[PDB]
């Protein structure tokens, strides 16, 4: 049985990172902020929370808005998350040393929860004014949930495969796991992955307001998202996009890069139990834990941390709290990211990966904001207060997203 | 190296087929058309034709439209295209045997071009007139682009994975690629994949005629869709969806089920050349094609059968020329389905690989409807004329869609 450990499958590691999110576009930035114990949740002053008396005036914006940094030809040619994926792209191949790899053994797989909705809808509209013949010529490559990865495939040049995968909250890390398959099983070398996510709009607040999954604590923003908290009473939407470079860790020595971290495994499993709410019991989210330690060669004892998945819902922390047991990780310090950069859908998986990456780098988990009251039937060993300096040696970063989607993903500290 | 052939990768078996068409909802009945050289493609009799004037005035509607199988409840809490999956999903299983499977060894891929873009747009109105709290707390469920694959895993109690590839017209074949990695890496040993995707509208009509990509032969629509011919003037579209049962081939034999093909290999690769028109070189899509020969443990002079992606453009028939030579496999017998069964964009990798299954299975290709005369660049053992008889022992199918996403899968006689 092939595993990371065994040497049945190549080791695998991160080189470079990048993401923007509502504390910073900068992760170096947003890693500072997190551990200072910032938050990017904030009073929303979008006309629309007014126009509709939304329940929920609360959320995180990009702290730094993708389009000031896109000129007028971008801003016509290509979709919102197409633009994201351009912005990360170019960030993290500079931050890599613009390396000169082979064409054909790179790969792009990054993942989208809603994708390009926003160019479809304005396609009706036009022809519905001029016709047919007026429909821009360009709306193909800007319609389809592709558009992203296909975008950063392009301007980088990845001839080994370029694929999005869509799972809901799961798309960027299921997106990570996927690209690490295309690397052990021998179809590349280097691989681009990550996720990216649209902006805060009416209609998914509205969406997610009415299945009662959102904070309304409207008083106090920084305050709403409160992960396995007893008090908490939903999720907050917190802008994101993040992509990460992952190689053989021989292609990495070729090149000079230093690794930030290994990524040793990935577990991809399903609830079956309904189209939005997670299993009460946790089994096959924490069998999607297992599976990554299976495949990196891994017990559950040497799992010292747990990036959660965390959204704050009532329902979704329980059930995540009895998956972490199930796979025997309940003794693991955890984080919960969304209490402080909130919830991005398609991306906020491989936020969260990156973020566990850093915590291997650097030996420090940032405090789980708004953890007042242990929750008892949550008995997790949550991080909190300020950050933890500990000896991490290895880590699950969790994503359990609506429709039980479940994606688990292991990553050591090199 | 593991492959198939030398015992690394477990036998991987296809077990059941069930697809939909503008020829018949019964596959073998759509099969039986093919052979007897029946088109799918009509004139288009849908109201928006004469509204717009539109220039693409043909193509095929299903035969028999999913909706006539669902009741107000599915009309109300389901996109087009969880519909759909919910058809296809249960027949699937009914040809299968309906057998008891364990669920946390079975897994679902399926891929989508466009997906379930129509509740999006529905869920702006509706809010634009009632507020937020009119939003149906089902939306979510309804408007992202995992749904079918969501409602089909639901379904069918699918616990080792739900998958959903969007990679334009190769979406299809790509979700039994992910599928069958899902079994040889041992994350499951049975799973649901294939492709679904809507129907025929206005608005995709318009963005792709205005590429220049489609037939306006609107006097003989049987006659428009012609694949590698020299007066070939782009696709047309024809309604599809389709679901393949693949399963380890002890799994199969466990159980009596009776295999119809081998699942050998797949290979994806990428053009990373433009965002809609493929690669003229064929290098990168030949690839896809010898990546899933050496997944296999094939030899180029094993491949008897390549059933051509072959849209009918010319520039897209061209470039899959170069390919299938690049790959060495241009002493095989080709088949272009779409010359009878048009374009599914999402669902149409799916619909052909049932076929090439088929083809397997029976012995048989079918001839390549309005081949009557070959293009000088195009120098390809097209079959035409009649069904060719003959003794196919591997086939490659071909889907290289829009944004240069190639996917190649090798299929063996069981
Ligand atoms: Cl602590
Ligand atoms: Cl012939
Ligand atoms: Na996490
Ligand atoms: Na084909």
Redesign the interface.
């Given at each position: 049985?092939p595993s990371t450990a065994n040497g049945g499958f190549p080791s695998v590691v991160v080189t470079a990172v990048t993401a923007t999110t509502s504390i910073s576009p900068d992760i170096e930035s947003t890693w500072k902020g997190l551990l200072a114990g910032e938050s990017g949740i904030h009073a929303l002053e979008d006309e629309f929370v007014t126009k509709?008396?939304?329940?929920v005036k609360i959320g995180g914006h990009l702290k730094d808005p993708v389009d000031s940094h896109m000129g007028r030809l971008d801003m016509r040619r290509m979709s919102y998350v197409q633009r994201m994926g351009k912005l990360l792209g170019g960030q993290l191949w500079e931050s890599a040393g613009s390396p000169e790899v082979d064409?054909?053994r790179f790969?792009?797989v990054v993942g989208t929860?809603?994708?390009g909705?926003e160019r479809?809808?304005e396609?009706?509209d036009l022809?519905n004014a001029g016709?047919?013949?007026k429909?821009?010529?360009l709306?193909?490559?800007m319609?389809?949930?592709?558009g992203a990865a296909?975008?950063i495939?392009?301007q980088?040049?990845?001839?080994?495969?370029?694929?999005?995968?869509?799972?809901?909250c799961s798309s960027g890390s299921?997106a990570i796991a996927?690209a690490w398959?295309?690397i052990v099983?021998?179809?590349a070398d280097v691989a681009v992955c990550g996720g990216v996510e649209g902006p805060i709009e009416?209609?998914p607040?509205?969406?997610?307001?009415?299945?009662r999954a959102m904070s309304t604590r409207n008083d106090e923003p920084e305050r709403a998202s409160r992960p396995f908290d007893k008090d908490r009473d939903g999720f907050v939407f917190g802008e994101a996009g993040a992509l990460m470079l992952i190689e053989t860790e021989e292609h990495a020595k070729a090149r000079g890069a230093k690794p930030l971290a290994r990524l040793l495994g990935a577990?991809?499993?399903?609830?079956?139990?309904?189209?939005?709410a997670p299993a009460a019991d946790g089994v096959?989210a924490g069998?999607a834990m297992t599976?990554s330690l299976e495949l990196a060669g891994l017990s559950p004892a040497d799992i010292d941390h747990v990036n959660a998945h965390g959204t704050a819902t009532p329902i979704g922390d329980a059930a995540e709290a009895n998956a972490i047991r199930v796979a025997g990780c309940d003794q693991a310090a955890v984080y919960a990211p969304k209490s402080a950069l909130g919830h991005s859908i398609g991306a906020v998986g491989a936020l969260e990966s990156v973020l566990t990456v850093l915590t291997l780098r650097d030996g420090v988990i940032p405090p789980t904001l708004n953890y007042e009251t242990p929750d008892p039937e949550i008995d997790l060993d949550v991080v909190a207060g300020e950050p933890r300096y500990g000896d991490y040696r290895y880590a699950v970063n969790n994503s359990f997203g609506?429709?039980?989607?479940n994606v688990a993903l292991a990553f050591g500290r090199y």
């Open positions: 049985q509709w008396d939304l329940a064409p054909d790969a792009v929860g809603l994708g909705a479809i809808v396609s009706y022809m016709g047919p013949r429909v821009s010529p709306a193909v490559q319609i389809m949930p592709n296909a975008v495939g392009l980088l040049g990845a001839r080994a495969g370029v694929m999005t995968p869509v799972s809901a299921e996927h398959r295309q099983m021998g179809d009416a209609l607040i509205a969406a997610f307001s009415m299945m577990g991809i499993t399903s609830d079956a139990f309904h189209m939005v096959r069998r599976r609506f429709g039980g989607h």
